[PDB]
A paper describes a structure:
The transcription factor and tumor suppressor protein p53 is the most frequently mutated and inactivated gene in cancer. The most frequent p53 missense mutations in cancer are found within the DNA-binding domain (DBD), where all mutations result in lower target gene expression through the loss of DNA-binding affinity. Structural characterization of these hotspot mutations revealed a druggable cavity in p53 Y220C, a mutation that indirectly inhibits DNA binding through the loss of thermal stability in the DBD. In this study, we identified the first covalent compounds that selectively react with the somatic cysteine in p53 Y220C to restore thermal stability to WT levels.
Author numbering: 91 to 115, 122 to 289
The structure:
Amino acid sequence: AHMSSSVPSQKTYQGSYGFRLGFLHVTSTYSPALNKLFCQLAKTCPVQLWVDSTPPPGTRVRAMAIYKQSQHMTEVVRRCPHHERSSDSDGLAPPQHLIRVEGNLRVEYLDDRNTFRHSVVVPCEPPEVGSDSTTIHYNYMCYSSCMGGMNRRPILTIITLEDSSGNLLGRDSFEVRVSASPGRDRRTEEENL
Ligand SMILES: *C[C@@H](C)C(=O)n1cc(C=O)c2ccccc21
Ligand SMILES: [Zn+2]
């Protein structure tokens, strides 16, 4: 219900370190033609992160969702009230956050004091040598159809690589549809282009 007075950039940017996302070829499936991830509710979505060169120490990877349509872009993407209130609040993620990271005890959940946007950050640990790729496991905690939240509006996930002093090192993004039938919905949306 909260309206921001800003919207993040969605410009794909590999930067100096060659940062970009990839998806491995069901509970989730990625459409290259649509650049769109289709997934089930609260199921693991593996996203591969790639670099061509090792970023400096202290980098972090941030994930944030925004609505894709301009008339909704200022609305903060969050869980619907029913899913927020019904949450066990047993883990690390605050119950209002749409995007969680699974399997990483160093994740931090952010609520921006000025923009009102939620995001989830994974701080990068010094990587073992020659290590050019890693997997982050994201979870989406509402359906795209949740009438009290996203309410059938498409969203984009924006993944940014940021250095320790906050400079943007890279950006990539993909559309998301969370539904009970990701494989069928991907087929349907792909057959309609
Ligand atoms: C999870 C961290 C912050 C990260 O983004 N990351 C770790 C490693 C380890 O080798 C990466 C390799 C390529 C991109 C991002 C990587
Ligand atoms: Zn919901």
